[PDB]
Design a protein around this ligand. Structure first.
Ligand SMILES: [Mg+2]
Ligand SMILES: [Zn+2]
Ligand SMILES: [Zn+2]
Ligand SMILES: [Zn+2]
Ligand SMILES: [Zn+2]
Lengths: 482, 138, 67, 115, 78, 1089
DNA sequence: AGTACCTAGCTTAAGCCTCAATAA
RNA sequence: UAACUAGGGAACCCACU
DNA sequence: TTATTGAGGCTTAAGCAGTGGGTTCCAGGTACT
C-alpha cells in the first residue's frame, strides 16, 4: 500500500500491519485457507478444534486428569498456516492427514456422514485411548478404610467381583475392568452382629470398560489416605464416532468398508474417509477443496503446504499447475474404480490428503437405554443421567405431539405406567385420601367416620405428591369418583 | 374511514385491537386471519386454512379478543387443573381453592394429571363386548 | 507418538523408515528426495513420513516411575 | 461395545447353511440362491459367468445389507434348462478358468525367472 | 336412529384392534379361522377384515347421549 | 385390595377446614417437638413421626401397616398459638374484608337490592366475577338493618394488614378470623364462596398441616421444608410459653410477626420486598410454591412431562438399505429393553426357549410375570421349576426384529417428529434411519441423537401401528403435501438417471432389478434393441413407479417459452415430466417431481396407492438409484468451482464497471449534483443508488458465472436436482461473494467515520463499506474477511434468538387449544363443550387429503364461458363428431333433454356468479378434496378411452349422475331446512367445481369418457370424498397449533416478532399501519392522492 | 481432646393516585 | 448350605442438536 | 359554593425451547475440663 507511483488512496499512512492474518485467534489460525470459507464454517471449526483429539500435553502419563483423550498417531497437517509454528500445533498435533475422496459411494455418507476405511482403522488410523480418573478418600469422623470387603463382615456389597481388589482395597494396574466393577474397596463402620461395616466402595461407570492404567496413593491436605486410579480405554473408530475437517465439516461415521470394498485409483490408493459431495455446496467450504489440492501437491512434492490466508503467492491455479507437474489431473480429480465390481466410475472423483480430527463425541459414550432401573426418592419417576441408569424424559412437547397423534393409550402409558404407576385409597364422601390397611382389609377415612365407602384410584405418584403439597398449602383437591 | 374520497369498504388496518373496537368481532376474526396469513406466507410458505381458521375461531369465540397468554387463556371457564398446567399454577390453584371451583375433568391435561385415558383420539369413545357376536366363535 | 508400522491407506511398511528419513534429512537431502530415496512413491506413504511427529522422544524425557 | 467380531464376515456359526435354494414363484424357471458368509468377491464372478450363458435369461446378485454377510443370487433360465445346473455350470467354468489362469501364471513365473 | 358417521374412524380402528389383540392374547376364542397365524395383532387384523370382531363401539355425543355401533355395522377403511 | 377401582370424574377444590385438618391428622395433640429424633428413635409428636409414614427402608408405618412403597404418607398438624395470614390467600382476604362490614360482619352492599340481584344474574354459576363485581360495588362504601359505623381502609405492608379509618390499628389475624367467622352463609353465596368447600375463616391459618415424610423425604439429610417446619414449631412453642407464662407487651407481637413470616415462607419464599428464609449454609429455602411453579417444578416438570422407562437414546447414522418405516437399533439397546409378551398356547414354545436362553443371551428374556403378579427374575438364575411357563403368564422378552417403537427427535415441533418404526437389529451401536425419514425429523448425521420409546402394552403398540407409522404420515395435514421426499444422493443421481442419454446394458439392468422389491420378475423390452440391447433409465424408473398413477410435472431447468412454442409435447431439453399408466414417458426428475412439494410423484403415489405402496416406492427409489450411483458416481471438487478465462474477464469487467459507477455516484453526491429522490434525504437516496449498482453487479456477475457452467459441473448438478445448494451459492463460489450487511444496511462506521482503520474517513465506496469483490475460490481480502465475519456473526445471532423466541410461541399456541377436537356430530368443540366450529375448516374435511385444484369457471370471460361450458345441441355434425349416432338422435329430437342441459348451464352460470362473489380476485387455485382432473385422466387410462372417436356417454346421464353424486356427498346429516342449508354451504365450493368439471360439454368434447368410465369416475369421487371427511376424535386444536408453530421455527414487522404481536393481543404493535384505499378520481389522480 | 446441642431488559394486567359534571 | 440393591438439593460452567 | 363520584396517569410481579457431562458446596464459636 506504500507506493507513490499510483494514486495510492492515501499518502499519510502512519502504521502498517505486521501480517493481516494476525487478526485470528488460536483456534482460527488452525484453519487452512480460512479466507476461502464461509464465515460460519470458520466459527464452527473454531468451536470444534477445541474438541479434537491429539496429545493434549506431553506429561499426560503422570497426570491423573479426569476425561483425558489421547490419539495414537497424531500427525502435523500437510497444509498448515504459518501461525501454527507459534501455536505449537506442529509439536502437539490433533489429527491425521487422510486420503479423502469426495464421492457418493453406496449412500452411507449422506447428509453429513462419512465412510471410513476399515482396513485403515485396523492399522491404527484414528485409534485413540480414553483415560478416566477415579479419586476416593478415606475419612475419620464413623471411620472409612481402604480394605477388601467380605460378605461375612460387610453390609451393602453389590454383586461384583471383589477379588479384583488387592489386600489394600485397591485394584492393581493392568487389571481389566467392566461396568459396576469395584476398583476401590471402602468400608464404613456402623455406629451400632451379622454386619459391622457398611460398603461404600466405588465402581466404574456402568457403560464404561477398560484396563486399569495407574493407581496412585498419597495423603490429602487433611492427612488422610487418598487414592487416584486411572482407567485406560482403547477407542477404535466405529460407526457413529464424530469426525470433522478443519473447515466446519463435521460428520459421524456411517459405515466402515474394508480396503477391497473401498474405491481405488489406478495406483491402488483407496480413501481413508469418503465424504458426501452435498456437504460442500450449501456450506461453501472451498478452503476444504483447496486444502485437499494443496495436500496432494505437498505429499507428492515432499514439503508442507502453506495456507496462510492472505497470501497472494498461493492461488488455485498455481497449485493446479504444480499438481499437473506430478502426473495428476490439475483439478485433483482421479479415475476411481468400484471396489465391488472393478468397473471404473463414470465420474472422476476429487480425492487427496486433507486433515481430519477425531472429536471427543464417541457413540459409546452416548448410547443409553433403560428397561426399569432406579427411581428418584422424592417422586418415584425414572432418574436423570446415563451414568445413573436413568430414563429419557417424555417432555411437554412430546405430550403435545402424542395428543396430536390421537394416541391416548400410548400417552397414558408413557405418562402413567412407564414412569410412576401408583394407586391410592380415597373416601367417597370427601375426596381426601383415606387410610388403607391392605392385609387386614380395613380401609377407613378418619374425619368422615367412613369405614366402607372407600375407593381405590389409580393415579400417578407425582399427582399424589402434587395433591399432598396442595393440602400442605391448605388446599383440598377433593377427588370425587362420582 | 370518515374522510372524503377514502373508501370505507376496503380501508383496513394492521392493528387488531382497533379493528375489534371499530368493526366488531367477526371483522377482527377476518383481519386476524389475513394478518396471520400474511405473516405465514410472506416467505412463500403455505399452511392449510383449517389451522389458521381454527386459531382465529379459538381466539375470537368468546366475543372479546382472547390473547394467547396467561391473560386470555387462564381467564376462561376451562377448569383449575388445565389452567394450572399452563402458567401461575399456585395462583390458579389458590383462586380455585378460595372460590371452591370444581374441575369437571373434561380436558386432556386434567386426565393426564390423574393418569386416566384422555378423551382424545382413541379415548373419545367406549368399547363394549358384543355378547351375540361371541356365539359364533371357536 | 511413534512412527506407524504401516501406511494407513495402503499398508506399505513405513515403521523401518523413520530413522532413515531422519538420517537423510541431516544429510542435507530435501524431504522429497529423502522420500524418493526410501522408495515411498505413493503420496499415501509419503505423508506418513512427511507429516509424522515423534512425540515419543519427548515422552522419554520423563523418568519412569519404576526403575 | 456393539462391535461384531471380525470372523462373522466369513465364518458360519453353528446352525446355518452355506447356500440355500429358494424357488422364485412369480416367473418360471427362476431360483433365489441365498449364500451365507460371502460378499461381492464371489457374487460378482458367479453373476458374470451366468451372464455368459445363453440359456440364462436373468442373472443378478445383491448384498441386502452390508452389515450382514449374505448374498442373494437370482437366476432365471430358459424352460429347457434349470437355474440349479446354470449355477453349477457357472461355478465349474469359473473353476476351470482359474485353473488355466493359475497354470499360465506359473508358466509366466518360470519364463520371467529364467529370462 | 343413529346420526354419527357410518364410517369407522382410524382411532376406532386403533383401539378396536388393540383391544381385540389383547383379548386374543388372553385366549379369547377367535371368530375367524387361522392359517397358522400366531401374532394376535394379525389375528385381530383378519378378524377386522371379516367384520367378525365382537366389539360394540359406544360413540359419545357432546350433549351426553351415546350411540352404540357394532364393528360389523361400520365401514372399514381397508 | 377390597376397594373398588374406578376413575375420578370430577375434582372439587376448597380450603381445608381447621376441624377437618384436626380430625384426619394422625398426630393427635399436634406437633410439639422441633427435634426429628430422640434417643436414636423417631419421636411421637415430633417432626419425623412414625405415625406419619415409613421412616426407613423395609419398615412399617404405625397408621397403615404398609412398607415405604405402598404407604401414601399420612398427614399431621400443628396447632398454632395465634392465627396467621395465609400468604396464598392474603389477596383474597384483603378483597373479602373490603366487601364485609368490620363490625356487623354483613355485606357492605345490602343483599336486598336490585344490584345484588343483577350481580347474581350476571355472575350466575361462576364465583370469580361474582367476587369481582361485589368488590367493585363495595369499593368506596362506608356505611352499612345496617350499622352507622364508618368502615376503614385496609392496606398491606408485606405480611401485615393495617386497618386505617379516615386512626390506624394493627389488624391482627385473630380479629380477621372473628370477622370472617360470623359471615352469613348467603353472604358467602353472594361473595362467590361455597361454605361447603371454602369458608372465609378457613383462609386464616389457625392450624398448620405438616406434610408426611413422603412429601419431605430425609436422605440424616433432612429436607429444607422440614427445617422450616422445625422453625415454625420452635416459634409456635415460644408463643405458647410466652402466652402462658410471660404475657409480655411487645415480645408477643415480634414473636407473632416471626411466626407469620415463617409460615408464609413455608408456603412461598419469594415475597416482594421481604428477606428470604435462609440457612447457615447460604441457600434460600425451596418452598411449596417453588416446588410447583417452574418448568422444572411439579406440574410442568413431573406431570405434563416426566422421565419414562423403556426408552433409549444414541447417535443416528444413515442406512439406505432400511425401509422408511424401519429403524436399525443396536443389539445392546435391544438386549436391555423388554416387551411383556403374554404366554398363549400359540407361542408357548418360543417363549419357553426365550426364557431358557435368559437375559445373558440377546434373543432371550428378563422376567416372567405369573398370573398372581409374582415376578421371576431371569438375570439371577432360578431353578427349572419356576422357569415353567403356562397360559396367562407374561414374559418380558428382549426387543427383537419387527418390534414397534416410537422414534423421536427433540425439538418435537409437529406430529412427524414422533413416528412409529419397525425394529431391525444391526451390529454397531447407532440408531440407523432411512434417508427420506430425516426431513420430517429435521435430522442429519453430524452427531444428532434421537430417542426411542418402546410401547409396552399390546393396545398401545396397535395404536402406534394404526396411527403413527411413518408411511401413514407421508403427507402432512399442515400443508396437504408430503413431508418425505427424495434426499441428496438419491435426488442428484435420479436427476442424472432420468436424462435422455442414460443407457444401461443388460448386466447393469439385471443388477438394478435386484433392488426392486416390487419387481414382477419380467425384464422389460429394451428401448433400443439394435445394434445393442440397451435400456434407458426411464424404463427402470417406470418399473419403480407403482401402480398406474398419472402425473405431469416440470423440471427446474424448463424454459418458459417451451410450453407455448413448438415442441411443447416433445421436449428438446427433456424438461417436461409426464407419467402415464405408472410409467415415465419423458422428463428429468428433480425435487419438483420427487420432493416434498404438493402434486409431486410421491404425493400422487400416496393419494392413489396408499401408504404401504408409497413406502415401497421410497425404498425402491433409494435402493435402485444408489446402486446405479455406484456405477455413475457423483463428486465435487476444484474443477467444479472454476470458470474459463473469458468468464473471469467478464466478472472483472463487471466489477470494475460497478466500482466506477459507485465512484461516480460518490462524486455526484460530493459535488452536490445528486438530486434526492422524493420521500427520502440525500443519505438514503445515495445508499439506494449504491445498493442498486452493487446489486446489479452481483446479478450480472452471477448470470455470467451461471452461463459458464457445463453439463458436467457438479455444483450445477446438485443445484438443478434440488438436492443441495442454490444458484446464489454457485455465484458466490465462482464470481463474487457480494455485499456484507449488518441490520439491513452496509457495514457501519464502527470507528470514527471509518469501517476499519485501513480506509480514509468518510469513505462510502464498495470495498470500504463491505462489498466483497472476490469469490470464495479467489480468496477474501482481510477487510472482506472481517466484513464477511460480521455478516456470519449476525446470522448466528439470528439463529440463536430465533430458536429461543419460537419455543415459547409453540408452547403458548399448544396450551391455548390442546383440548379442541372434532366431536362425533362432526362439530369442533373445546373442553368446556363449547362449539368453536360447526364443521372442521367450515367444510368438515381433514387437511391431509385435499389438493390444489383450479376452478375453470371463475376466470374466463362471458363468451368464453358460454363457448366452453354450454352444451351445443344444435350443431349436428359437431355432435356426430363428438357423440355416437343414437345419442345424437336422442339429443336432437328430445326437447326435455335440451331443456335440462340448458338448466345445467344456467345452474353453472349461477355458480359462476357465486364464485365471483366468493373470490373477488380472479384466483382460481383452490384447495379441494378430490382431484377431478387426475381422476378423469385415470378413467381415460384405465378404460382405454380413445379421444379421436365419438363417445357412448349420454350427456343426460352426465347431468343426472352429477346430481345423484352431489346428493351422495354429505357433510351435514339431516332433512331439516337448517341441516339442508348447512349441507349446501359445506359442499358449495366442491359442488361448483364438480358441476364445472363434470359438465356435459366437457365430457362430450375434452374428456370423451365412456359410460363405464363415467360410472367409475362417480364412484371414485364419492369414495375419495368420503375418505376426506375429518374423523371424530381428531385433535384438530393440537394439529393446528403444531401446523402454525412449526413454520415459525424456520422464519413493517414480519416473521417471529409480528407473529408474537398477533398471537397475544398487543395494545402497542411495533409498526401499526393503515391501508387506505381511495374513491373516485383520487384513486387514479396522483395529485388528489 | 470429643463433642452435646442450640440455635439485563421487554410487555402487560392489577393495584393505586388528582381533576371535572352534578345534585345538595 | 445364594441371606438381592441403586439414593439428595442448590448454584455455576462447558458441550450438543 | 362544594363535596362527590366518575375517569386518565404511576409501580410491580410474571413470564422467558430442550439433552448430557463436570465442579463445588452443603458451619465455626468459645466454654470446659
Ligand atoms: Mg445435526
Ligand atoms: Zn372422607
Ligand atoms: Zn501407502
Ligand atoms: Zn402410612
Ligand atoms: Zn355494619
Amino acid at each position: 500500500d506504500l507506493q507513490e507511483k499510483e494514486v495510492a488512496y492515501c499518502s499519510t499512512y502512519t502504521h502498517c500491519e505486521i501480517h493481516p492474518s494476525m487478526i485470528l485467534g488460536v483456534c482460527a489460525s488452525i484453519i487452512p485457507f480460512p479466507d476461502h470459507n464461509q464465515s460460519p464454517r470458520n466459527t464452527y471449526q473454531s468451536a470444534m478444534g477445541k474438541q479434537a483429539m491429539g496429545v493434549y500435553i506431553t506429561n499426560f502419563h503422570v497426570r491423573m486428569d479426569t476425561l483425558a483423550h489421547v490419539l495414537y498417531y497424531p500427525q502435523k497437517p500437510l497444509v498448515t498456516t504459518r501461525s501454527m509454528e507459534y501455536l505449537r500445533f506442529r509439536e502437539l498435533p490433533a489429527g491425521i492427514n487422510s486420503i479423502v475422496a469426495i464421492a457418493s459411494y453406496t449412500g452411507y455418507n449422506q447428509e453429513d456422514s462419512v465412510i471410513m476405511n476399515r482396513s485403515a482403522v485396523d492399522r491404527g488410523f484414528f485409534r485413540s485411548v480414553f483415560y478416566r480418573s477415579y479419586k476416593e478418600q478415606e475419612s475419620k469422623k464413623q471411620e472409612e478404610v481402604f480394605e477388601k470387603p467380605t460378605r461375612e463382615t460387610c453390609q451393602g456389597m453389590r454383586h461384583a467381583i471383589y477379588d479384583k481388589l488387592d489386600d489394600d482395597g485397591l485394584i492393581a494396574p493392568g487389571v481389566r475392568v467392566s461396568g459396576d466393577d469395584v476398583i476401590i474397596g471402602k468400608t464404613v463402620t456402623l455406629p451400632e452382629r451379622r454386619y459391622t461395616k457398611r460398603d461404600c466402595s466405588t465402581f466404574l461407570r456402568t457403560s464404561e470398560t477398560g484396563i486399569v492404567d495407574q493407581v496412585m496413593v498419597t495423603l490429602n491436605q487433611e492427612g488422610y489416605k487418598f487414592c487416584k486410579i486411572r482407567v485406560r480405554s482403547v477407542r477404535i473408530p466405529q460407526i457413529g464416532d464424530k469426525f470433522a475437517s478443519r473447515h466446519g465439516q463435521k460428520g459421524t461415521c456411517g459405515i466402515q468398508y474394508r480396503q477391497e470394498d473401498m474405491p481405488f485409483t489406478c495406483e491402488g490408493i483407496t480413501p481413508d474417509i469418503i465424504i458426501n459431495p452435498h456437504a460442500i455446496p450449501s456450506r461453501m467450504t472451498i478452503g476444504h477443496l483447496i486444502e485437499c489440492l494443496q495436500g496432494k501437491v505437498s505429499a507428492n512434492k515432499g514439503e508442507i503446504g502453506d495456507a496462510t490466508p492472505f497470501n497472494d503467492a498461493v492461488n488455485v491455479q498455481k497449485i493446479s499447475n504444480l499438481l499437473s507437474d506430478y502426473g495428476y489431473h490439475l483439478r485433483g480429480n482421479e479415475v476411481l474404480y468400484n471396489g465391488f465390481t472393478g468397473r471404473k466410475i463414470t465420474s472422476q472423483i476429487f480425492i487427496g490428503p486433507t486433515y481430519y480430527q477425531r472429536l471427543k463425541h464417541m457413540v459409546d459414550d452416548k448410547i443409553h437405554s433403560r428397561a426399569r432401573g432406579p427411581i428418584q426418592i422424592l417422586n418415584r419417576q425414572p432418574m436423570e443421567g446415563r451414568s445413573r441408569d436413568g430414563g429419557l424424559r417424555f417432555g411437554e412437547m412430546e405430550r403435545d405431539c402424542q395428543i396430536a397423534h390421537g394416541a391416548a393409550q400410548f400417552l397414558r402409558e408413557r405418562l402413567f405406567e412407564a414412569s410412576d404407576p401408583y394407586q391410592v385409597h380415597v373416601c367417597n364422601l370427601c375426596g381426601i385420601m383415606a387410610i388403607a390397611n391392605t392385609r387386614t382389609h380395613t380401609y377407613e377415612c378418619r374425619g368422615c367416620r367412613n369405614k366402607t365407602q372407600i375407593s381405590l384410584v389409580r393415579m400417578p405418584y407425582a399427582c399424589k405428591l402434587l395433591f399432598q403439597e396442595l393440602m400442605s398449602m391448605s388446599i383440598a383437591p377433593r377427588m370425587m369418583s362420582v | 374511514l370518515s374522510e372524503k374520497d377514502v373508501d370505507p369498504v376496503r380501508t383496513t388496518s394492521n392493528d387488531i385491537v382497533e379493528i375489534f373496537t371499530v368493526l366488531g368481532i367477526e371483522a377482527v376474526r377476518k383481519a386476524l386471519e389475513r394478518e396471520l396469513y400474511h405473516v405465514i406466507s410472506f416467505d412463500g410458505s403455505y399452511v392449510n386454512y383449517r389451522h389458521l381458521a381454527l386459531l382465529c375461531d379459538t381466539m375470537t369465540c368468546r366475543g372479546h379478543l382472547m390473547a394467547i397468554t396467561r391473560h386470555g387463556v387462564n381467564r376462561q371457564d376451562t377448569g383449575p387443573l388445565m389452567k394450572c398446567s399452563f402458567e401461575e399454577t399456585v395462583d390458579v390453584l389458590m383462586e380455585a381453592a378460595a372460590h371452591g371451583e370444581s374441575d369437571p375433568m373434561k380436558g386432556v391435561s386434567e386426565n393426564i394429571m390423574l393418569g386416566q385415558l384422555a378423551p382424545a383420539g382413541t379415548g373419545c369413545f367406549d368399547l363394549l363386548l358384543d355378547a351375540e357376536k361371541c356365539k359364533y366363535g371357536m | 507418538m511413534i512412527i506407524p508400522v504401516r501406511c494407513f491407506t495402503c499398508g506399505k511398511i513405513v515403521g523401518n523408515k523413520w530413522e532413515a528419513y531422519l538420517g537423510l534429512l541431516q544429510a542435507e537431502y530435501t524431504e522429497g528426495d529423502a522420500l524418493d530415496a526410501l522408495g515411498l512413491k505413493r503420496y499415501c506413504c509419503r505423508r506418513m513420513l512427511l507429516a509424522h511427529v515423534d512425540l515419543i522422544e519427548k515422552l522419554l524425557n520423563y523418568a519412569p516411575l519404576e526403575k | 461395545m456393539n462391535a461384531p467380531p471380525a470372523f462373522e464376515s466369513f465364518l458360519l456359526f453353528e446352525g446355518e447353511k452355506k447356500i440355500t435354494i429358494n424357488k422364485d414363484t412369480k416367473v418360471p424357471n427362476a431360483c433365489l440362491f441365498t449364500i451365507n458368509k460371502e460378499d461381492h468377491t464371489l457374487g460378482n464372478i458367479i453373476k458374470s459367468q451366468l451372464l455368459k450363458d445363453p440359456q440364462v435369461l436373468f442373472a443378478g446378485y445383491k448384498v441386502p445389507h452390508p452389515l450382514e454377510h449374505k448374498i442373494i443370487i437370482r437366476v432365471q433360465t430358459t424352460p429347457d434348462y434349470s437355474p440349479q445346473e446354470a449355477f453349477t455350470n457357472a461355478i465349474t467354468d469359473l473353476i476351470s478358468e482359474l485353473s488355466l489362469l493359475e497354470e499360465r501364471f506359473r508358466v509366466a513365473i518360470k519364463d520371467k525367472q529364467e529370462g | 336412529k343413529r346420526i354419527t358417521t357410518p364410517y369407522m374412524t382410524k382411532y376406532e380402528r386403533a383401539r378396536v384392534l388393540g383391544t381385540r389383540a389383547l383379548q386374543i392374547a388372553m385366549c379369547a376364542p377367535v371368530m375367524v379361522e387361522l392359517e397358522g397365524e400366531t401374532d394376535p395383532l394379525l389375528i385381530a387384523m383378519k378378524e377386522l377384515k371379516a367384520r367378525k370382531i365382537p366389539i360394540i363401539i359406544r360413540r359419545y355425543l357432546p350433549d351426553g347421549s351415546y350411540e352404540d355401533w357394532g364393528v360389523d355395522e361400520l365401514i372399514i377403511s381397508d | 385390595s377390597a376397594c373398588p377401582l374406578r376413575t375420578i370424574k370430577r375434582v372439587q377444590f376448597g380450603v381445608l377446614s381447621p376441624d377437618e385438618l384436626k380430625r384426619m391428622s394422625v398426630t393427635e395433640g399436634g406437633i410439639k417437638y422441633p427435634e426429628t429424633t430422640e434417643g436414636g428413635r423417631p419421636k411421637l409428636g415430633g417432626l419425623m413421626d412414625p405415625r406419619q409414614g415409613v421412616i426407613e427402608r423395609t419398615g412399617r408405618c404405625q397408621t397403615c401397616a404398609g412398607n415405604m412403597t405402598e404407604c401414601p404418607g399420612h398427614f399431621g398438624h400443628i396447632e398454632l398459638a395465634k392465627p396467621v395470614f395465609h400468604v396464598g390467600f392474603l389477596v383474597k382476604t384483603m378483597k373479602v374484608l373490603r366487601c364485609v362490614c368490620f363490625f356487623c360482619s354483613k355485606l357492605l352492599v345490602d343483599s336486598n337490592n336490585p344490584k345484588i340481584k343483577d350481580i347474581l344474574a350476571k355472575s350466575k354459576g361462576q364465583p370469580k366475577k361474582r367476587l369481582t363485581h361485589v368488590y367493585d360495588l363495595c369499593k368506596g362504601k362506608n356505611i352499612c338493618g345496617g350499622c352507622g359505623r364508618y368502615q376503614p381502609r385496609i392496606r398491606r405492608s408485606g405480611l401485615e394488614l393495617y386497618a386505617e379509618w379516615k386512626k390506624k390499628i394493627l389488624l391482627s389475624p385473630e380479629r380477621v378470623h372473628e370477622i370472617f367467622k360470623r359471615i352469613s352463609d348467603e353472604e358467602c353465596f353472594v361473595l362467590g364462596m361455597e361454605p361447603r368447600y371454602a369458608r372465609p375463616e378457613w383462609m386464616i391459618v389457625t392450624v398448620l398441616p405438616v406434610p408426611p415424610l413422603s412429601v419431605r423425604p430425609a436422605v440424616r439429610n433432612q429436607d429444607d421444608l422440614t427445617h422450616k417446619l422445625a422453625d415454625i414449631v420452635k416459634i409456635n412453642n415460644q408463643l405458647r410459653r410466652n402466652e402462658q407464662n410471660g404475657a409480655a407487651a411487645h415480645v408477643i407481637a415480634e414473636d407473632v410477626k416471626l411466626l407469620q413470616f415463617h409460615v408464609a415462607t413455608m408456603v412461598d419464599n419469594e415475597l416482594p420486598g421481604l428477606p428470604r428464609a435462609m440457612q447457615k449454609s447460604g441457600r434460600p429455602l425451596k418452598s411449596l410454591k417453588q416446588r410447583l411453579k417452574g418448568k422444572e417444578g411439579r406440574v410442568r416438570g413431573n406431570l405434563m412431562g416426566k422421565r419414562v422407562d423403556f426408552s433409549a437414546r444414541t447417535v443416528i447414522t444413515p442406512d439406505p438399505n432400511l425401509s422408511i418405516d424401519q429403524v436399525g437399533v443396536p443389539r445392546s439397546i435391544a438386549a436391555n429393553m423388554t416387551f411383556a409378551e403374554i404366554v398363549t398356547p400359540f407361542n408357548i414354545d418360543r417363549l419357553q426357549e426365550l426364557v431358557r436362553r435368559g437375559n445373558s443371551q440377546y434373543p432371550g428374556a428378563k422376567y416372567i410375570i405369573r398370573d398372581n403378579g409374582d415376578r421371576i427374575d431371569l438375570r439371577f438364575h432360578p431353578k427349572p421349576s419356576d422357569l415353567h411357563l403356562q397360559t396367562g403368564y407374561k414374559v418380558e422378552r428382549h426387543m427383537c426384529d419387527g418390534d414397534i417403537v416410537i422414534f423421536n427427535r427433540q425439538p418435537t415441533l409437529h406430529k412427524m417428529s414422533m413416528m412409529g418404526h419397525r425394529v431391525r437389529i444391526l451390529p454397531w451401536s447407532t440408531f440407523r434411519l432411512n434417508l427420506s425419514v430425516t426431513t420430517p425429523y429435521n435430522a442429519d448425521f453430524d452427531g444428532d441423537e434421537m430417542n426411542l420409546h418402546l410401547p409396552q402394552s399390546l393396545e398401545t403398540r396397535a395404536e402406534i401401528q394404526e396411527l403413527a407409522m411413518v408411511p401413514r404420515m407421508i403427507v402432512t395435514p399442515q400443508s396437504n403435501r408430503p413431508v418425505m421426499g427424495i434426499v441428496q444422493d438419491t435426488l442428484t443421481a435420479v436427476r442424472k438417471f432420468t436424462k435422455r442419454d442414460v443407457f444401461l446394458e443388460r448386466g447393469e439392468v439385471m443388477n438394478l432389478l435386484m433392488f426392486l422389491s416390487t419387481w414382477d420378475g419380467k425384464v422389460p423390452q429394451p428401448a433400443i434393441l439394435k445394434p445393442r440391447p440397451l435400456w434407458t433409465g426411464k424404463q427402470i424408473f417406470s418399473l419403480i413407479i407403482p401402480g398406474h398413477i398419472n402425473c405431469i410435472r416440470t423440471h427446474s431447468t424448463h424454459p418458459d417459452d417451451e410450453d407455448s412454442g413448438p415442441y411443447k409435447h416433445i421436449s428438446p431439453g427433456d424438461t417436461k415430466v409426464v407419467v402415464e399408466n405408472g410409467e415415465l414417458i419423458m422428463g428429468i426428475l428433480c425435487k419438483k417431481s420427487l420432493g416434498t412439494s404438493a402434486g409431486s410423484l410421491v404425493h400422487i403415489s400416496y393419494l392413489e396407492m396408499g401408504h404401504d405402496i408409497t413406502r415401497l416406492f421410497y425404498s425402491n427409489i433409494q435402493t435402485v438409484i444408489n446402486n446405479w450411483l455406484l456405477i455413475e458416481g457423483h463428486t465435487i471438487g476444484i474443477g467444479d468451482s472454476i470458470a474459463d478465462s473469458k468468464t473471469y474477464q467478464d466478472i472483472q469487467n463487471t466489477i470494475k464497471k460497478a466500482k466506477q459507477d459507485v465512484i461516480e455516484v460518490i462524486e455526484k453526491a460530493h459535488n452536490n449534483e445528486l438530486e434526492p429522490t422524493p420521500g427520502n434525504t440525500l443519505r438514503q437516496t445515495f445508499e439506494n443508488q449504491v445498493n442498486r449498482i452493487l446489486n446489479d453487479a452481483r446479478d450480472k456477475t452471477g448470470s455470467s458465472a451461471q452461463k459458464s457452467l457445463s453439463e458436467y459441473n457438479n455444483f450445477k448438478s446438485m443445484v438443478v436436482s434440488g438436492a443441495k445448494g442454490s444458484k446464489i451459492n454457485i455465484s458466490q463460489v465462482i464470481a463474487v461473494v457480494g455485499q456484507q450487511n449488518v441490520e439491513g444496511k452496509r457495514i457501519p462506521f464502527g470507528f470514527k467515520h471509518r469501517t476499519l482503520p485501513h480506509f480514509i474517513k468518510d469513505d462510502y465506496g464498495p470495498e470500504s463499506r463491505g462489498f466483497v469483490e472476490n469469490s470464495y475460490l479467489a480468496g477474501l481480502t482481510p477487510t472482506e474477511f472481517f466484513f464477511h465475519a460480521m455478516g456470519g456473526r449476525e446470522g448466528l445471532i439470528d439463529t440463536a434468538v430465533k430458536t429461543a423466541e419460537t419455543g415459547y410461541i409453540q408452547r403458548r399456541l399448544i396450551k391455548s387449544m390442546e383440548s379442541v377436537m372434532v366431536k362425533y356430530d362432526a362439530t369442533v368443540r373445546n373442553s368446556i363443550n363449547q362449539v368453536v366450529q360447526l364443521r372442521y375448516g367450515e367444510d368438515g374435511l381433514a387437511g391431509e387429503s385435499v389438493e390444489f385444484q383450479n376452478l375453470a369457471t371463475l376466470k374466463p370471460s362471458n363468451k368464453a364461458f358460454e363457448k366452453k361450458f354450454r352444451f351445443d345441441y344444435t350443431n349436428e355434425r359437431a355432435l356426430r363428431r363428438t357423440l355416437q349416432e343414437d345419442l345424437v338422435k336422442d339429443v336432437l329430437s328430445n326437447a326435455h333433454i335440451q331443456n335440462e342441459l340448458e338448466r345445467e348451464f344456467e345452474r353453472m352460470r349461477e355458480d359462476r356468479e357465486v364464485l365471483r362473489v366468493i373470490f373477488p380476485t380472479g384466483d382460481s387455485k383452490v384447495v379441494l378434496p378430490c382431484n377431478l382432473l387426475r381422476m378423469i385422466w385415470n378413467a381415460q387410462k384405465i378404460f382405454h378411452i380413445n379421444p379421436r372417436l365419438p363417445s357412448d356417454l349420454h350427456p343426460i346421464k352426465v347431468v343426472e349422475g352429477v346430481k345423484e353424486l352431489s346428493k351422495k356427498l354429505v357433510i351435514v346429516n339431516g332433512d331439516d331446512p337448517l341441516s339442508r342449508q348447512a349441507q349446501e354451504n359445506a359442499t358449495l365450493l366442491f359442488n361448483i367445481h364438480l358441476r364445472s368439471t363434470l359438465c356435459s360439454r366437457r365430457m362430450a368434447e375434452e374428456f370423451r369418457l365412456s359410460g363405464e368410465a363415467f360410472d367409475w369416475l362417480l364412484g371414485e369421487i364419492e369414495s375419495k370424498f368420503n375418505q376426506a371427511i375429518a374423523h371424530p376424535g381428531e385433535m384438530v386444536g393440537a394439529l393446528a397449533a403444531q401446523s402454525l408453530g412449526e413454520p415459525a421455527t424456520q422464519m413493517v414487522t414480519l416473521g417471529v416478532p409480528r407473529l408474537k404481536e398477533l398471537i397475544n393481543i398487543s395494545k402497542k404493535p411495533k409498526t401499526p399501519s393503515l391501508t387506505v384505499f381511495l374513491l373516485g378520481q383520487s384513486a387514479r389522480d396522483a395529485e388528489r392522492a
